[PDB]
Design a protein around this ligand. Structure first.
Ligand SMILES: CN(CCc1ccc(Br)cc1)C1CCN(c2nc(N)n[nH]2)CC1
Length: 377
C-alpha cells in the first residue's frame, strides 16, 4: 500500500500553533510525500515561494532519516490557472523544454518524481484540444523519465497526477485509459464534492450517495468517483484514494434547520488559523465548543453545527470506513490533503499528533515495526 501525503509551502505563514514547516514532518508517517506547489516560467519548472530552495533541502533531507521514503514535486494547483499549461503543451518544442527542465530541476533538488496538478485540461478556460495534449504531455514525461533512467543509471523518476472526481471535468480533460498506462499512480481528489458555492448544505467528501439524490448529484461521492476512474481504465493498484483532513463550512439560512440539504446563505465563518471562509482544518472543527456532531447515515461521514454554522468534515471513524472501502476495491492506497490540516502537533484535538493521518497509516497496515511513538485510533 501507498500513503501519499501533501505538504504545502504556504502553511509556514499560519500563526501560532498552526504554523507548519518541514521539521513538523514525520519521515515515517507516509510512504510518499508530495510538495505543493511548483510553478512554471517560460515553460520551465520553477519555485513559487521565496524560500522554496531552503524548504526543498529540509523536505528531501527527510530521506536521510527514512531512506524508504519517496518525494515528488507537484506543479500547478487550483489557483495556478490553465494558461501556462495550455501554452506549454501547445507545441512539441515547448513540451520538450518543460520535460527537460523537470528532469534537471528534480535531480538538482533531490526529488524522486513529478506530480501533475493542472486544474484542468479542457475546463476552466483550457481549450478542448488540451485533453489530447495532456495525454501527450503525460506520455512525453513518462518516456523521458524512462530514457533518463537508462542513460544515467539512476532510479527512474516517478510520474503521478492529481485528478478530479467530477464527470464533467473527467470527460473534458482525461483520456483515462491512456494516461493511466503512463502514470505510476493516480491521486484521486475525492473531496470538494460539495461546498458553499451551493445553496444548500452538503458534505465535502461523502462515501456514498444520499437516498434522496438523483441525476448527476448521485455521482458526487467517493464510491462513484472511484468506480468512474476504475471503469474508465485505471488499474486499481494505481488508483490512490484522496482523503481530506479538512471540512467545508456553510452559514445556514436558519439555525433551526441543520439537516444535510438545508438552505445555506453562503460560506461558513473563517477559521481562526486558516482564515478562509468555507473551509476549516480538522484542528479547527475537532474541538468546537458547544457544538452538536451528527453523522450522515447514508454517506458514512460526520457533520457538526453550532448556531447558524454547519461543517461537513472527516474524522477518525470516516477515515477508517474509507480505508476499509479502498481495500475492498483493491486500490493502491490513500492520498491525503494535507499534512498541515491534520492536528499535526496535537495542539487541538486531544488525539495526539497526526490523528487522522496516523489512522490512515494504521488501517493500511503501514505502521513501522520499529515505531515507538505512534498512537492507535
Ligand atoms: C480547493 N481544495 C481545498 C483547499 C483547502 C483545504 C482546506 C483549507 Br482550510 C483551505 C483550502 C483543494 C483542491 C486541490 N486539491 C488537491 N488535491 C491534490 N492531490 N492536488 N490538489 C486539494 C483540495
Amino acid at each position: 500500500a501507498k500513503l501519499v501525503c501533501y505538504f504545502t509551502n504556504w502553511a509556514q505563514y499560519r500563526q501560532g500553533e498552526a504554523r507548519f514547516l518541514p521539521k513538523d514532518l514525520d519521515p515515517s508517517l507516509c510512504t510518499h510525500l508530495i510538495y505543493a506547489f511548483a510553478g512554471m516560467t517560460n515553460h520551465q519548472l520553477s519555485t513559487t515561494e521565496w524560500n522554496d530552495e531552503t524548504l526543498y533541502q529540509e523536505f528531501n533531507g527527510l530521506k536521510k532519516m527514512n531512506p524508504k521514503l519517496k518525494t515528488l514535486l507537484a506543479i500547478g494547483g487550483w489557483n495556478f490557472g490553465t494558461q501556462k499549461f495550455t501554452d506549454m503543451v501547445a507545441t512539441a518544442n515547448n513540451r520538450q523544454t518543460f520535460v527537460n527542465s523537470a528532469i534537471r530541476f528534480l535531480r538538482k533538488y533531490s526529488f524522486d518524481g513529478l506530480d501533475l496538478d493542472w486544474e484542468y485540461p479542457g475546463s476552466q478556460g483550457s481549450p478542448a484540444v488540451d485533453k489530447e495534449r495532456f495525454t501527450t504531455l503525460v506520455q512525453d514525461l513518462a518516456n523521458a523519465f524512462q530514457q533518463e533512467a537508462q542513460t544515467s543509471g539512476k532510479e527512474r523518476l516517478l510520474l503521478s497526477a492529481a485528478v478530479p472526481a467530477g464527470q464533467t471535468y473527467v470527460d473534458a480533460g482525461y483520456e483515462v485509459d491512456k494516461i493511466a498506462q503512463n502514470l505510476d499512480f493516480v491521486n484521486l481528489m475525492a473531496y470538494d464534492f460539495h461546498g458553499s458555492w451551493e445553496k444548500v448544505t452538503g458534505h465535502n467528501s461523502p462515501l456514498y450517495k444520499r437516498q434522496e439524490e438523483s441525476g448527476a448529484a448521485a455521482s458526487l461521492n467517493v464510491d462513484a468517483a472511484v468506480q468512474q476512474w476504475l471503469q474508465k481504465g485505471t488499474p486499481a493498484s494505481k488508483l490512490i484514494l484522496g482523503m481530506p483532513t479538512y471540512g467545508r463550512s456553510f452559514t445556514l439560512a436558519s439555525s433551526s434547520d441543520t439537516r444535510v440539504g438545508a438552505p445555506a446563505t453562503g460560506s461558513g465563518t473563517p477559521g481562526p488559523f486558516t482564515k478562509e471562509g468555507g473551509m476549516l482544518a480538522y484542528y479547527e472543527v475537532c474541538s468546537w465548543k458547544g457544538a452538536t456532531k451528527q453523522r450522515i447515515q447514508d454517506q458514512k461521514v460526520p457533520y457538526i453545527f453550532r448556531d447558524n454554522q454547519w461543517v461537513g468534515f472527516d474524522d477518525v471513524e470516516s477515515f477508517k470506513t474509507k480505508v476499509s472501502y479502498l481495500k475492498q476495491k483493491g486500490l493502491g492506497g490513500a492520498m491525503v490533503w494535507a499534512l498541515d490540516l491534520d492536528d499535526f502537533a496535537g495542539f487541538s484535538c486531544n488525539q495526539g499528533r497526526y490523528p487522522l493521518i496516523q489512522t490512515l497509516r494504521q488501517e493500511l497496515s503501514l505502521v513501522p515495526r520499529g515505531s515507538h511513538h505512534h498512537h492507535h485510533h
